[PDB]
Every structure is written in C-alpha cells, then in structure tokens.
Amino acid sequence: GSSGSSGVEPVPDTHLRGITCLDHENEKVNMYCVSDDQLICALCKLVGRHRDHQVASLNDRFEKLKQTLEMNLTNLVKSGPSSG
C-alpha cells in the first residue's frame, strides 16, 4: 500500500472583474430565470432549484454543445492541534 497526507489552501481573493452566481461563486451567470426573475447560471438550471424552470438563454450561438461527466475528486480534512 501507500500513505499520503495534505492540507488545503485558502481561496484566492477574487477581483471585481467578473460577476459570478450567488449560489455558485464559480459559474458566470449565463442565463436568466423568468418566473423567478433572477439571473442564474448553468448549474442553477442543471440541478439548481431551477430544474424545470423557464429560462431565456442569453448566448444566441450555443456554446456548450456536448456534455459529459467529469471525474470526481476525493480528499480529506480534519482540524488538529495548534499553538501561538
């Protein structure tokens, strides 16, 4: 077998040069919900509460045509001792 350990790095202070989604601070809202009258992203319409909602696509020319599943990552995390 094998043994390995690791920690985690703090998210980089995102600049104000790119508006993201509320729930998802990574996906750039590329859609807009009519019923909810609120800008949403792909993840919001994919699995988000807007699963079967009526959104009005923005980008005329479909960009994301093909769709596949991305390999999921499995990591660990647990706080330990410390001093000052």
Catalog residues that contact Zn ion under the rule CB under 5 A: 21, 23-24, 33, 36, 41, 43-44, 50, 53
Minimum Å distance from CB 2 to Zn ion? 38
Minimum Å distance from CB 23 to Zn ion? 5
| Minimum CB distance to Zn ion smaller for 23 or for 58 | 23
**CA proximity to 48, closest of 67, 68, 33, 60:** 33
| Annotated binding residues | 21, 24, 44, 50
